[PDB]
Design a protein around this nucleic acid. Structure first.
Lengths: 299, 445, 445, 297
DNA sequence: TCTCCACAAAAGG
DNA sequence: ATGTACAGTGACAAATTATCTGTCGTC
DNA sequence: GACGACAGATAATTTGTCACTGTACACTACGCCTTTTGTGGAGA
DNA sequence: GCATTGCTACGTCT
DNA sequence: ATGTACAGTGACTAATTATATGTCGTTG
DNA sequence: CAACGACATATAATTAGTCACTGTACACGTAGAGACGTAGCAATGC
């Protein structure tokens, strides 16, 4: 009917092979896209190595619902005007939970992946190995915003997808504050808060306000894998978790960090550690065993 | 600010299913049908489902499950008995005293007898009231420290200033431990547990030198370890080393605890001569670069040795005295091979990509030229100040002395330096225009 | 010879639910019809439910739950590696050597590179293999002894016999401990932790008497404790006693450990004079009756006191030294009041209906006649054998003194009993038949 | 029909007020009976203070199925020769269903007045409480084996009810070994084993053969509350419990002991402990606190 | 050539 | 902003047997 | 409607990975004390 | 006297 | 047959409140 | 023909006591060893 209506979610295996910062190969990423029904507009996206599951569709839905602020590094001359909450969320134990928590109806039942592949993905060098996930998602955002939302679908009028979506709003939907969508984020269950209110997450130290008093306790973690520079701390009661604070990563060489980059750094450090030889240590332990074997007791 | 419902029960799951069936938009006439269908499948009244949907919309999935009662965590005995129990426990555990909850219950009973109260809280109630305090205390004593990350590092001093560790041989940490291994002499007989004085570079965590011996920690033992660290290391074939202990040079800062051997004027001499600025640590946790290697040595090398006394009386094996069979020389061989082959060749855990020795060598600002081992020995010599009389009649340590150039220089207090291992020959210095010069090795008679 | 199925595994619970339709007696046709109908209950074939009913017939309720795989608890690393890991742990943990699973994994890697095996067992695999051994060691270290029950009781001895305890003074136990309270002189300065020597009846578990003092366990200290336990008890108003320590009498046996104070010649004479035989105990746990109460004193009296050192150095408070406030007199008053008003009036654990003093008083075969102080003091006196010179003047411990009726036996060796606190006056005996009679005393002049 | 075809189990509260062996006044017992419906003959009884639940029904069924043996203290004239397992069982969670599946019969989840008239009314304390659990059980067993089972029913009366049961059995039933009935017995969990193969149960020590090797481990106890002199020890394997041995009580002054008697002994010991006054205890505690507070500086 | 009277060493707690 | 790291562990993916589960066959 | 052969098919174990964390390193028992059992110097 | 050179002990730290 | 025994705990019961829950009556 | 407050009955969630069971310390045990600086004092040559 009107714009904010049935939202469709589909899963696609993106055929652009990717590498990390240091060059080690990584599997082909997945794409999960939310798309409007009244328009053919891409509602929100999620690109990552994680296979289809409740978490990835939840993240894509959170992206679709929320207003989108993108940095100047994206070179976006057009702003993305997507926001709001749908009446239905036809997609595909957990998704119904967010459906009841936000108000929409989730269903476990014309995918736009073909044009994405034929206009953007084929151009990429690793099309089926020189692109990281960050560059892929930058190009994907470029294509979705500047080349897809601005595609006047003549079969659906002389107006473009974004303005067709905008004209279909009964009224401006008041955006949901981001906190009420932490249910859609990824979870780390048990995390020990250390002295001074710090957390050790993905081989990084995270510090946040109101956390010094929780030293020695255990807290939950809610994070967005696209940007783990800020993570959410939740304290577990009998049947609920309450927001506690935001934790920020320290010692970051760059202002932006994703889960993939942290995993890549950990992988590089682990490989560097494993590349160190061990023959000398084994010879030493063997010779110490031999030396203690020859020596006599007080008999 | 935000509340999320998790770990909801199976009954909560069926309620979630019914709320999902109740969420599809529809009309009053057909909405009411599924409303009473929900009432029937939940075997409750329709107004119960009305309350269910009301609390679900006003609270979310948190309102789906029944909220815990306000008396959860509260105690029905009364605020007065609550406060009395808490105060009795807190006061009785203040200082070296230790009052268990049973004694708190006993005191509660005594007070109730004094108050003519026939319903005092039970001992189980006292345990329940005091459980949060005990759990909080245990959590307080079980707090983990994040530690330093990355390459940058500073060490806090007892002077209150933070000293930066920037490169190799910038800050050296030296500390003493009592080795957990019993040793025997020739033919087999236990003597003691040796003292281990370890000096390690802070920037690289590489062991610069060691001193293992029965002599107690002292300015002399610290001097021996300092000589071992400064001088190039050469070891014979008896130490079956595969790698090479190529660590040497002089530091610019010396970060140690408040031990008397470290605050001694002899160590101040070593600092003035070689070029140290010795520093103190406010807390032992501020010298963790030098304490953790003791734990690593105990875990990886010392625990496998025959005569082994765990670092406790509670963990000490009963066979340590009868299993004691190694000597000091063999223990030194094993320790040196462990350090050269295993420890310095191991990964600096802070960085994770380079060995401690490789970090030390790569972190050297300039490759140093070693001391010819005679100036260094003179540097690590006990000093005093003596007066030469009658053309030379030095009596230091109740021994006769007479130099060759000491005849005329018999009216000035002469600086005196020596090595306690050999009092036969000494060194004598002048003090002219804020300088000094060597006169003669004043021999003993 | 039987198995009972528990924790029925809701999948297996509905499996039981279906297996109860096949149980009802029926003909072939409807049995097959309900077989097929119940096949769709759990979405399986008909051969599967045939096997189901066959297994339920063969094994009962345990055939409804899938049996564990036969490889559970076994390891696929190979028999050789398993034996190598187990033997390496066993030998590396022989004696004082302590060897962790990580060291076993390191040796596994060493042997693997020796044998050119490219897949050594992992460290996690080593931990999994060694977990049963550590678990059984923990179970062995946490073994509970049932203890004696009822009135019948005997104490094992080093001689191998069992010393029956049947009367209220048949067997007395005495042992020493160091009190966990740092005491203080009359000024406010720490002296030491006192020694607690306790005398307790074996049959009644009542505290016969105590000795609290700064002197180490000696024959004199055991004599003081025996004197306290034998003589009637009199305490002034300073001990705010509500009850009385109505305890006294001789013992017939004396049960102690192998301490030199208890194996002394002085204790032998004490027993031969007071008519009791001293006995040994093979293990310290055989003297549990005298050895447990120390803990009871720590958990109820000493832990509450301003100066307190804990059970060992691992639990010793850092506040113990500066919190020390109690003198020996105050501690002994508190201890005596605890024994008289709590411990002796407390219920004997095995009985459950009698107090320790009630059990002691009721179990007395006859009311013992109080022993005069002088006779008991003479009995517990240190003695030796000495002779007398010409004109008397017997000399004793670098001192000399003479009395009467002494010179007439110059040249005869006689017994010499004295109190090692007032040596100025001693008792000179004489063996004048096969009997020994009181010759005289040697008093200082 | 025939004998041992359908069994019915019903509960009642005996109007007799019972006391323990020490005289303390207890509550009124619960009587559970199993009836061979085709013969109306008493199958098994369970007389105790436990409210009717799955365990009481299981105990009654265990009594009914197994062969009956009673000592000389019961003064029995006839012998209770009724046994065998039923093809059906009627009684008032899932425990009974599991028991029926294990023992091979169907359990369906839905004669008190004739005992209350000529037995319970006669007995003392009916509706002066002087009878104990053992005495009441002895009287009930004697009455059942000597009068009710040896009685003649109002209809088709030509032989005793026991004789009607015996003649109505198509085949003599092969006895079920006692161990297979352990599913019906009372269960205690998480019981530690001590040195020498001992465990504590109802404030008593139980030495068990072939139990020394399990010292320091945890076992499960199955026992008959009517006779707890010998209990049965089981090992838990997270999916099943396997029999180990029979543990025997020690230090008992009597060859027979029931759960009620052990509970009464424990109650007597607890009361005797409670009568020990503790005014001296509290006085010492408060003056010790005063003395330590005096030294405070 | 015995008796006092110091030492030291072994062996328990 | 920051004590120091190593044994040990939780959660999980990967590898590997081993019972399981459908079909035919003969009852 | 009972079983066994026989071959994929689950799925239940073990095995290995790696990020995270608990906790010991912070000088610490072999020494103190006692008592018997030689062995040897001052005297008778 | 008066200044060195030895002691001994005591506080303090590990 | 047997070491000792007390502080703390687990499982259960009883007392004690705090909401859950099926009507009555107002509200659109 | 369904929302919103009382309401007063009824579960039922929460705590306060009971009471048999079990783990575990009791088993001689850190204030002492050793070193170093800072006072006092004494031997001692002028």
């Amino acid at each position: 009917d009107y714009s904010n209506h049935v939202w469709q979610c589909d899963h696609t295996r993106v055929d652009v092979l990717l590498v990390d910062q240091h060059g080690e190969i990584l599997s082909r990423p997945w794409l999960t896209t939310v798309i409007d029904t009244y328009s053919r507009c891409i509602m929100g996206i999620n690109l990552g190595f994680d296979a289809p599951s409740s978490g990835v569709v939840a993240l894509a839905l959170r992206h679709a619902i929320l207003p989108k602020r993108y940095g100047s590094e994206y070179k976006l001359h057009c702003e993305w005007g997507t926001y709001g909450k749908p009446e239905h969320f036809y997609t595909d134990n957990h998704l119904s939970q967010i459906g009841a928590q936000l108000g929409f109806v989730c269903h476990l039942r014309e995918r736009p992946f073909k044009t994405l592949n034929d206009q953007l993905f084929s151009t990429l060098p690793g099309y089926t190995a020189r692109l990281t996930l960050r560059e892929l998602e930058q190009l994907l955002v470029r294509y979705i915003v500047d080349r897809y939302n601005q595609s006047i679908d003549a079969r659906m009028g002389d107006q473009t997808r974004f303005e067709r979506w905008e004209a279909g709003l009964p009224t401006v939907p008041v955006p949901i504050p981001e906190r009420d969508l932490d249910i859609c984020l990824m979870k780390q269950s048990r995390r020990t808060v250390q002295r001074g209110g710090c957390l050790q997450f993905q081989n990084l130290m995270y510090r946040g306000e109101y956390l010094a008093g929780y030293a020695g306790e255990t807290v939950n973690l809610r994070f967005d894998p696209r940007d783990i520079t800020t993570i959410l701390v939740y304290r577990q009661e009998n049947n609920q978790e309450v927001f506690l604070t935001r934790a920020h990563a320290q010692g970051l060489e760059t202002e932006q960090l994703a889960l993939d980059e942290a995993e890549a750094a950990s992988r590089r450090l682990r490989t560097a550690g494993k590349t160190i030889s061990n023959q000398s240590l084994l010879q030493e332990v063997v010779d110490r065993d031999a030396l203690v074997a020859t020596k006599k007791s007080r008999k | 600010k935000n509340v999320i419902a998790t770990q909801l029960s199976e009954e909560a799951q069926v309620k979630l299913e019914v709320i999902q069936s109740l969420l599809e938009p529809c009309d009053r006439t057909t909405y009411g049908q599924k409303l009473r269908e929900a009432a029937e499948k939940l075997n409750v009244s329709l107004r119960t489902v009305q309350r269910l949907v009301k609390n679900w919309e006003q609270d979310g999935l948190v309102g789906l499950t029944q909220t815990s009662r306000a008396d959860k965590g509260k105690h029905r005995i009364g605020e007065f008995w609550e406060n009395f129990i808490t105060k009795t426990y807190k006061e009785g555990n203040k200082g070296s005293k230790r009052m268990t909850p049973k004694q708190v219950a006993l005191r509660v009973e005594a007070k109730a007898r004094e108050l003519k109260d026939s319903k005092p809280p039970n001992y189980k109630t006292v345990l329940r009231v005091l459980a949060p305090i005990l759990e909080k205390q245990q959590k307080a004593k079980s707090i983990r420290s994040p530690g330093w990350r990355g390459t940058t590092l500073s060490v806090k001093t007892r002077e209150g200033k933070d000293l930066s560790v920037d490169y190799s041989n910038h800050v050296w940490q030296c500390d003493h431990t009592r080795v957990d291994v019993l040793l025997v002499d020739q033919h087999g007989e236990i003597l003691s547990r040796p003292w281990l004085t370890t000096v390690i570079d802070t920037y690289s965590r590489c062991i610069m030198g060691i001193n293992l011996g029965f002599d107690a920690p002292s300015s002399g033992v610290v001097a021996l370890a300092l000589r071992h660290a400064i001088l190039p290391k050469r070891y014979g074939s008896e130490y079956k080393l595969h790698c090479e202990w190529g660590t040497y040079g002089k530091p610019e800062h010396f970060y140690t605890d408040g031990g008397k051997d470290f605050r001694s004027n002899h160590l101040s001499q070593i600092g003035a001569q070689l070029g140290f600025v010795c520093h103190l640590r406010d807390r032992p946790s501020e010298g963790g670069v030098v304490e953790r290697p003791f734990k690593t040595l105990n875990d990886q090398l010392f625990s496998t040795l025959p005569g082994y006394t765990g670092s406790n009386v509670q963990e000490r094996p009963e066979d340590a005295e009868k299993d004691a069979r190694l000597t000091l020389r063999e223990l030194e061989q094993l320790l040196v091979r462990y350090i050269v082959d295993r420890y310095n060749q191991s990964i600096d855990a802070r960085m994770g990509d380079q060995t401690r020795f490789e970090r030390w060598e790569a972190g050297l600002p300039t490759v140093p030229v070693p001391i010819p081992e005679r100036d260094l020995d003179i540097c690590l010599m006990k000093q005093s100040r003596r007066t030469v009389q009658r053309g030379g009649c030095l009596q230091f340590q109740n021994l006769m002395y007479r130099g060759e150039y000491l005849a005329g220089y018999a009216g000035e207090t002469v600086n005196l330096r020596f090595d306690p291992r050999d009092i036969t020959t000494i060194l004598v210095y002048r003090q002219e225009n804020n300088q000094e010069v060597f006169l003669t090795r004043a021999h003993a008679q």
